[model samples]
Target: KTTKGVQLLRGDPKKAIVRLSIPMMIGMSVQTLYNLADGIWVSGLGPESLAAVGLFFPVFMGIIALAAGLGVGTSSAIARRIGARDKEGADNVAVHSLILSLILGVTITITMLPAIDSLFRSMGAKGEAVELAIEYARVLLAGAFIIVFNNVGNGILRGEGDANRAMLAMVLGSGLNIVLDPIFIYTLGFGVVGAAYATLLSMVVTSLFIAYWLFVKRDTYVDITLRDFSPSREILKDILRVGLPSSLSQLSMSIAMFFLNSVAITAGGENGVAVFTSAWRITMLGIVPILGMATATTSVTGAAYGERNVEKLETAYLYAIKIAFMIELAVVAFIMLFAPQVAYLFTYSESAQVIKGDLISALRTLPVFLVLTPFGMMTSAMFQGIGEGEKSLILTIFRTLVMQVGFAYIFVHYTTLGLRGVWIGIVIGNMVAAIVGFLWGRMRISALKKTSA
Candidate 1:
């Protein structure tokens, strides 16, 4: 069955990119809100609670990085297969993604569950904050498979251009999380741990819906079945070709954050982490649209590559960056104009109020990088789409590890900018990375055109 989504997948590149990206932007926007709600509610528990959650936030990001990375692999592989008109190949990739998710998810739960206490302690979390972080990380760790499963499922949807369903799944999870946060944290008195429960429960609900679609409903463009569970070396390699590097790229970001968290701690103690947390969450919300467009960039460009249409691939790739840049500019303008108001959402409680001023400073400064992100981010997405995952990985490491962390380290230790130094370093690093990455992306496109000609 060549569904409407399949038609869109192979249709006009520009239309497909926009049509596919809009729903994901909406979905991720709500997803970002769900992320903010965690900090917002936890803030009421005091800075200690907020900091505890913040302490484990990077570790959680690592888990998400792994899951989303696998999803990217799945989505890129499946998209290329669909573009090549190989339905059976797409089906095989789908099955492989789920199995891989289950295996990796379980591994994460078992490994991280024991390491939580030491992990936080090593990062300078102590006393009540480390204990609270342990409690929070353990819950999310135990239910890590749910997060993994949902991402792979969503990847399958996006790979086939079924952005609406992907959006539905995200909306369902995020909306439920938003509602459950207050209930579990306040009314049910779960405290900070309740946020974990809310998050896990929402993912479970989302995963169930995805299961119904793939197994029961069986209405997706690619047919997934146990009977066709023929895993091959080529298929695994294809997925990992994009997926492993994708995972590492994301993991590098988390690792960079871990270092940056330590930098914050060194510069300003627990309050530094709190301010970073509040400001960073808003910064992420700002880039949600760019992230949304990136998914479409990968799928659209992957399809074009699979079809051996270099022109269409370049068209989709550059077009996404253009649109994403415009969207981010508007986001930056809005955040800059309203940084204080946005800062208040995370620092409303008395204990949390101390960081309001610094958080506002972070909001204004950190978001300056948002305007430069589309160039780097869309370039990496195009690399993944074209089966150049290593290139994407290199770019990310350069941005997150080499440039971002490097500059931040130098600023905090060598200069007097302190916490604000971290923000400045990030902005400068991203600006440099964006310029370099965009040049590389253009060169790659030219090479592809030459080869095809």
Candidate 2:
């Protein structure tokens, strides 16, 4: 069957990219609801519970990074394979990707189980928050495999440009999560633990549903069967070619968060962590529309790369960045102009005024650096799509890791800005990374044209 991804070489670039991207925009927006819903409920539990979730977040992000990195590898590999019209190779990639997800699940569960308490404690979590964090992480991490399966399954659908199915899969999980959120969190009175259980339950069902679609219903372009399920060195390498770097890029962000969580807690105790996490969850809403553009760019660009269609590649890449910047710019503007009122949405009480005040400061401080995110996000997606993992990896490291963290430390301790200085470091770092990413992307695009010529 000829899929949109397979036929990407022959379309009006704008229509093609937008068509492929819309489902993902819907999917990503729904998926982010999982965070927002959690924020909405947990905020009522008071700042300590909210802070517990935030403290637990770095560990959770690491696990999520693992699956996402694999998915990136899978999507890039599968899309490129679809472009090359290599059915056998594409199926092989999908098979191995599934196997890898299972291993990751088990590995994460075992490694994280014993270390959960000490990890958060070291980050300055104390008393009720630390205990709350441990409870949440234990329940969530124990079911890590379910989350892994869901992520990898979603990736397979995406790589084939079957955005509708990918969108459905996410909608299924996130929708289920939304339903379960109130039941488990409020109705059952399990508090933080109930929220974790809700996630696990929804993840289990979503993973199974996608698995059924992939294997039982046979909806994907590549037929994944048991006959070719054995691991192949070449297939693993192919998946890792982009996967490792993607994983590291994601892991870099988690590590940066880990550092920042410590910084927040150290600077303002649990309240710092609470305000920062809540503000960041809201930030995810800002990036929803652009997420689709990034994913859609990867799908089309990979196809273009496979055909060596330099024109299509450039067209898609430029168009995505243009639209992304326009949308993201508006979001950043809204954030800056209404930072205080925006911060008020998460907390219920005017009595929690300190958190509201701190969050308002953060909301104002954080977004300036993100104005340049479209460049970084689109370029990273473009590079990964074209199998230039090295470029994405380098930029992601400097942008999310070195620049974000290094500046954060210097500004926090060395300068008198304290936590506010840490926020400043983030803006400056992102600004530097954005400037560098745009220039690097332009150079690479020129190089691709030159090589083709």
Winning model by lDDT: 1
1-453, model 1: which lDDT tens digit per residue? 588887998999999989999999999988888876676688779878888887887888788888998899899999999999989888888988889989989999999988877788996768999988898888899889989999999999999999999999999999999999999999999899899999989998999999999999999988888784496898888888888898798778878987988989987788898888777777776678888899999999999999999999988998998898888889899999988887666677556257777888888788899989999999999999988899999999998999989888988999999889989999998889999999999999999888988
Per-residue error for 418 in candidate 2, Å, reads: 7.6
Which residue pairs clash within candidate 1?
A: none
* Candidate 2 error regions (>4 Å): 4-10, 43-55, 114-135, 228-231, 258-281, 355-365, 405-425
Query: What global local distance difference test value does model 2 have?
Result: 0.81
Number of clashes found in candidate 1: 0
Cα lDDT listed for each candidate:
0.89, 0.81
lDDT of 2 by residue, 386-405 (tens): 88777898998888778888
Per-model TM-score versus the true fold: 0.89, 0.86
For candidate 2, report its TM-score: 0.86
lDDT score, residue 99, model 1? 90
